[PDB]
């Protein structure tokens, strides 16, 4: 580990200090279908004509990034993804820009979101969940080893590849930080007590989000939910959590320390950090090197009818991409 991260940290720092830009153009890909939309961009299934490959292209409306005050965040995402390298992180193949947009072309993961299978299946058996948690746990050791905080863990951001392993998407809040940070960001159900309380926080929030993940994965529902965000925040800071009857004793214990309101008593952010997690009972059967190597038998393999297939993604209204004749936000996105 300490040996692994060492090398890893050095390759990231090189790209970090020398990010690559303009490695492709829009005309080299074939726009085929929208797979996800949102606030200021959308992801499209695209086809690279020269290699005949399929990729997930993330298109950011520059003016929209600006009105939502997400400039620095967007720069964070691209700069960080062009430099990280781990098996549970989707790869940033190309990144470029034109008059109106920012583009991040990455590997296409046809398996679909963990969210869909989860909601469709209802809830995962503990083993199947631990197999996913483990992957998040390792990936978080990687990111954190590099001073990165992820900040948006949740089923929606987890894709399942062919081998059945996790692929983390969306680094819109990923940030390289040594020290406290104060940006309020994330998704309601997963917010840490610290964040909601606007009290300056650290990596400990990713570990809390992990606790929420494991629980939803294993309960079928979130540990804190209500129809309105404020309602949800009241449960989050309450320091109270209930667990289904099927939850194993160990799982309740591992979770009691993960969802620890007091971040000076929360697993992950202790003197042993990660290990307090990796050496936990619920994980006692986990073979980490095995998991990091993908040699572990996957709980379930997604059904893919082939490359370019999108039957594991919901449909979405289409819209023609438009690039104005004039540059829209030159200076703001200069380094992208």
């Amino acid at each position: 580990v300490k040996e692994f991260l060492a090398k890893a940290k050095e390759d990231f720092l090189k790209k970090w200090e020398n990010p690559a830009q303009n490695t492709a153009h829009l005309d080299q890909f074939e726009r085929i279908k929208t797979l996800g939309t949102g606030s200021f961009g959308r992801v499209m299934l695209v086809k690279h004509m020269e290699t005949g490959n399929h990729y997930a292209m993330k298109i950011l409306d520059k003016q929209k990034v600006v009105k939502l005050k997400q400039i620095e965040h967007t720069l964070n995402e691209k700069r960080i993804l062009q430099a990280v390298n781990f098996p549970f992180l989707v790869k940033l193949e190309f990144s470029f820009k034109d008059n109106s947009n920012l583009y991040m072309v990455m590997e296409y993961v046809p398996g679909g979101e963990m969210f869909s299978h989860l909601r469709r299946i209802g809830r995962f058996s503990e083993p199947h969940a631990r197999f996913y948690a483990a992957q998040i746990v390792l990936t978080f050791e990687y990111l954190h080893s590099l001073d990165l905080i992820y900040r948006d863990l949740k089923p929606e951001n987890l894709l399942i590849d062919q081998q059945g392993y996790i692929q983390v998407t969306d680094f819109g809040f990923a940030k390289r930080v040594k020290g406290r940070t104060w940006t309020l960001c994330g998704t309601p159900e997963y917010l840490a007590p610290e964040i909601i309380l606007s009290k300056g926080y650290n990596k400990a929030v990713d570990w809390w989000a992990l606790g929420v993940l494991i629980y939803e994965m294993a309960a079928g529902y979130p540990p804190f939910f209500a129809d309105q965000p404020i309602q949800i925040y009241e449960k989050i800071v309450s320091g109270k959590v209930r667990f289904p009857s099927h939850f194993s004793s160990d799982l309740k214990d591992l979770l009691r320390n993960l969802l620890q309101v007091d971040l000076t008593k929360r697993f992950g952010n202790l003197k042993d950090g990660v290990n307090d997690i990796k050496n936990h009972k619920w994980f006692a059967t986990t073979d980490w090197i095995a998991i990091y190597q993908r040699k572990v038998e996957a709980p379930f393999i997604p059904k893919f009818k082939g490359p370019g297939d999108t039957s594991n993604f919901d449909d979405y209204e289409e819209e023609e991409i438009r690039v104005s004749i004039n540059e829209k936000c030159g200076k703001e996105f200069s380094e992208f």
Binding site: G38, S39, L68, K69, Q70, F115, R119, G122, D152, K154, E156, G172, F173, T183, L184, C185, G186, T187, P188, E189, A219, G220, Y221, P222, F225, A226, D227, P229, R242, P244
Partner: peptide
């Protein structure tokens, strides 16, 4: 049941991120 209250709750779809 908690599972039922969740299914009947308006929060079972893809949840949007917040910040501002």
């Amino acid at each position: 049941t908690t599972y039922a209250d969740f299914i009947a709750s308006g929060r079972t779809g893809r949840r949007n991120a917040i910040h501002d």
